[PDB]
Amino acid sequence: CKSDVMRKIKIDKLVLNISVGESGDRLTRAAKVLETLTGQTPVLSEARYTVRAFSIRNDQIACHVTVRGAKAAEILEKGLKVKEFELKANNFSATGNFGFGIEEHIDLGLKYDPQVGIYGMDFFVVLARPGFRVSRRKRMQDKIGRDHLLTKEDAINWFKETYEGIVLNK
Amino acid sequence: YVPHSATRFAGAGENEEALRSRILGGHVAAYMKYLSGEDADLYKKQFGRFIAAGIAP
Amino acid sequence: PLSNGRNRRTRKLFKRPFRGHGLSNTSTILHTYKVGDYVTILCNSSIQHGLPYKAFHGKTGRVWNVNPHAIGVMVNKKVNNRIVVKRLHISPEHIKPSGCQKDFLERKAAVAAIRKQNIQLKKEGKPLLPLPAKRLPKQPRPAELIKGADIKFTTVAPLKFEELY
Amino acid sequence: SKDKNRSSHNQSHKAHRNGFYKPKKSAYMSTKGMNVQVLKNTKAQRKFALAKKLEAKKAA
RNA sequence: AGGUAGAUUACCUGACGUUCCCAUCUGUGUGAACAUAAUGGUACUGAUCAGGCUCUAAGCAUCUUUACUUCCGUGUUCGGAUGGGAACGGGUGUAUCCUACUUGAUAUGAACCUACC
RNA sequence: GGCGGCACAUCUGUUACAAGAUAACGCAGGUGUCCAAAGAUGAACUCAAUGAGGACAGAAACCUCAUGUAGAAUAUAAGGGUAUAAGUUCAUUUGAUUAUUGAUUCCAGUACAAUCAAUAACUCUGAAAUGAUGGCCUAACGAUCCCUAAGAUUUUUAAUUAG
RNA sequence: CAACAUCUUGUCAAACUAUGAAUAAACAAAGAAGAAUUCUCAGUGUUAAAUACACUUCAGGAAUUUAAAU
């Protein structure tokens, strides 16, 4: 009857972002791989500050998407298995999140084209506890307690159990 | 008398019977007769006290 | 040399009170003003619509008319060598209930209480109570005795000059 | 030939010779621009009392 | 005791921890339809399997902050007025008004209508 | 005096002296514009920055969490105002309309111009209370005569039939 | 080393400010005609309806007390 069931750490959101420096064509292709990877259309992102060194303020630059629930679990399994569950101990944020990046989208090899080329992708995993709604609800918006909030080490133990992947301290 | 416009009730689309049925718990009644058609544990989980109290859809 | 703008020289006049920004009170819009009341014009810069002129800030006026969203205020203005009557229509966000007659209003209550008793005493035969005494400036204090049993003495003399460095 | 531009010297003394003319009591009792419904109520009653008073004068 | 609506708008805020839920509140389950968005995360709707874990509320601390009180200090400054003093610069005496910063002590809310325990 | 400048119509802070008024060819600056949205309304969101993380990616690209009283943004000069907004995004729309009053600001209590409070229409947004007669406020401008456009069908009558 | 944090220290602002005087500015200290109370009371309108409330010479009318209010 212990209330530990209300402290069960779980995934609440997984964001995949494809940030390219060009607008058009390539972005129309980078957004198409995320529709196949996740099943839902992504959202395009525009530049915040224009810089001539990067050849980039109203033009679409990136295309990210967030998946939650059971769908985010298998996509995390695919992304983690590319790294073979080898995540460094420096990849965990102090807030309890962690992330990594990939170079080649493995996607599908049956129908592959050189038009889409090769894209790199990043993964970010946002954990939560049952009771995190208090900061997101419209009415009576409050702050989660310090003890309820996760930490860097609280995310490490969760990652070392549900996937058994060891954490490198090199 | 409460001033209002009739474009935000359960109608505002479909017709009056769509609003009238929802006033009579039509959406709740159609839920069980759909949930029971698909599964039984799902029907028990959602309407646990409805089944025990004997309220037919 | 200044300019003739409507809201000239309001860097400090129209600034909000320290930690007094944002919305105003709710009693500001709930206060019930009636014709004949005394009000104080206090231009609230947070409401730029219907803002009264900066010359009437702090002026005390009398309510002369009540309108659905604005309250009529009638104040006195000083001109070259005469005084003119200024009639304004001001929303409640810029006026305030004046307390000029707070002392006067309680004196009327004190007299009305005594007078109400004088109609309970004359017909019943008891001697009638008098009205409260009128206000007077601080009068010369009368003679009195000071006991020598609970008294104490401290001598007073010029202090020897001591340097602060 | 420059001149002195402006001075308030001897202006308060001039203003207090025939001092600040206060407005009369008739200035505070004006009723122009008052509430429309309040004005209608007053006119409706003043016409009711006037007709009644003039009828009694007519009878005698 | 709790919940809804409030008025005063930090004695009501912020940080570190702590205490119950018996009712209520909350978090909690689900996505077929109203309706929702890239995501049932928000909002929407249907429900009651579990929980006081966070909320919320009550309290702790030589706690920052905040609000009152003495002190600072009749000190700075100031209105009136010399054939007063000084080469200036500035600064008395007289009859008057008298802040501020700071430090020390106290507090950490009071209060209105409706329902239910 | 000339040459220079506009202190000539004008707005912001300061000089300026804790009501109002207020000098210098005093100081630091500003105006003759711009906007079918940058007007109106409804909804949603919260900005700058910092800390910790993620391939290229680094001091500056994009993504996530936490802190974040506005340190951002608000067409412009400066000063005021603004956080379930007045800022950003989305959706609808043209009240940036017609007619009549009474006031406030320069005021000589003249005109121009500006600022308001109502009434009678027809409408916009919203579920609604409300809001809307241009721009969050303080500058963004104009007589007599002349020319050039818009408006006066509501109603009142005459003639002929029936009473 | 520097740098960045944090605690102290010395000195400043007409175009900086929390706080904030002295002097001042505008009210009240009893004029629908010098107060008050009791009874009676009407027309419009607000209002869910009002006997509440608003204005109407503190609508109006009659009695009693009353010249008081730095």
Side-chain angles (χ1 to χ4, degrees), chain C residues 14-44:
Chain C
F14 275 1
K15 218 195 139 197
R16 308 294 316 280
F18 190 67
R19 300 167 14 202
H21 304 263
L23 270 186
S24 77
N25 284 5
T26 294
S27 46
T28 299
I29 68 155
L30 278 169
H31 193 266
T32 302
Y33 298 94
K34 304 210 171 178
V35 152
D37 290 322
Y38 291 97
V39 282
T40 288
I41 305 179
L42 289 187
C43 329
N44 196 27

Side-chain angles (χ1 to χ4, degrees), chain A residues 13 17 19 45 47-48 54 62 91 94-95 97 99-100 120 124 138:
Chain A
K13 167 217 272 165
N17 185 32
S19 62
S45 148
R48 188 167 157 221
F54 299 151
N91 277 45
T95 46
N97 316 341
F100 48 87
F124 209 74
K138 190 183 159 11

Side-chain angles (χ1 to χ4, degrees), chain C residues 101-112 135:
Chain C
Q101 280 190 332
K102 158 155 165 283
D103 189 335
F104 187 37
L105 280 201
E106 61 77 16
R107 268 188 262 121
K108 292 181 145 182
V111 157
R135 279 145 63 244

Side-chain angles (χ1 to χ4, degrees), chain B residues 3-56:
Chain B
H4 69 272
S5 203
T7 85
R8 291 243 157 244
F9 301 126
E14 315 277 333
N15 212 30
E16 273 91 334
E17 51 262 350
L19 165 56
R20 176 194 113 101
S21 34
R22 209 179 254 267
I23 292 175
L24 302 184
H27 59 319
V28 202
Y31 195 17
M32 339 177 197
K33 75 181 48 172
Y34 159 86
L35 214 54
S36 299
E38 321 313 293
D39 216 318
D41 45 34
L42 293 201
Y43 168 62
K44 201 269 314 164
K45 206 201 189 200
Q46 175 85 359
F47 292 100
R49 285 174 335 196
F50 280 71
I51 296 154
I55 294 133

